[PDB]
Curated annotation (Swiss-Prot):
GO terms for biological process: endocytic recycling; endosome organization; Golgi vesicle transport; intracellular protein transport; regulation of protein localization; retrograde transport, endosome to Golgi; synaptic vesicle to endosome fusion; vesicle docking. Widely expressed, with relatively higher expression in brain, lung and kidney. Residues 38-71 form a coiled coil. Belongs to the syntaxin family. SNARE promoting movement of transport vesicles to target membranes. Targets endosomes to the trans-Golgi network, and may therefore function in retrograde trafficking. Together with SNARE STX12, promotes movement of vesicles from endosomes to the cell membrane, and may therefore function in the endocytic recycling pathway. Identified in a complex containing STX6, STX12, VAMP4 and VTI1A. Binds EEA1. Interacts with VPS45A and GOPC. Interacts with MARCHF2; the interaction promotes MARCHF2-mediated ubiquitination and degradation of CFTR. Interacts with MARCHF3. Interacts with BLTP3B (via C-terminal coiled-coil domain). Interacts with BAIAP3; this interaction is increased in the presence of calcium. Interacts (via N-terminus) with VPS51. Interacts with VPS13B. GO terms for molecular function: SNAP receptor activity; SNARE binding; syntaxin binding. One of its GO terms (cellular component) is terminal bouton. Keywords: Acetylation, Coiled coil, Endosome, Golgi apparatus, Membrane, Phosphoprotein, Protein transport, Transmembrane, Transmembrane helix, Transport. Residues 1-106 are annotated as: Interaction with BLTP3B. This is Syntaxin-6. Residues 1-106 are annotated as: Required for interaction with VPS51. It is found in: Golgi apparatus membrane; Golgi apparatus, trans-Golgi network membrane; Recycling endosome membrane.
Length: 106
């Protein structure tokens, strides 16, 4: 019943959908022979919505950990577990970054 895992679940699902939108976005980069202007607009829009949503959730998770980080045991949470949680944020942010970087590079 730890809120962390609920948000983590939501973030992972969002990431999964972003993977699909990214793949499609990539295909649309082929030009007018494989994409209409509306397809690129909506596809870009939804992809961006998902990435933004992911970053805000991660932001929330970071801020939460920042609080407990000082006194782990007080909340019945081990420092190792906190390390692992921070790692999920890092790994997720990397996936997001790579997608945003390529979109910016295109």
């Amino acid at each position: 019943e730890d809120p962390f895992f609920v948000v983590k679940g939501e973030v992972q699902k969002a990431v999964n959908t972003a993977q699909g939108l990214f793949q499609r976005w990539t295909e649309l980069l082929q030009g007018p022979s494989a994409a209409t202007r509306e397809e690129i607009d909506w596809t870009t829009n939804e992809l961006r919505n998902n990435l933004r949503s992911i970053e805000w959730d991660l932001e929330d998770l970071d801020e939460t950990i920042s609080i407990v980080e000082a006194n782990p045991r007080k909340f019945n949470l081990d420092a190792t577990e906190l390390s692992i949680r921070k790692a999920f944020i890092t790994s997720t942010r990397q996936i997001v970054r790579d997608m945003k970087d390529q979109m910016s590079a295109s």
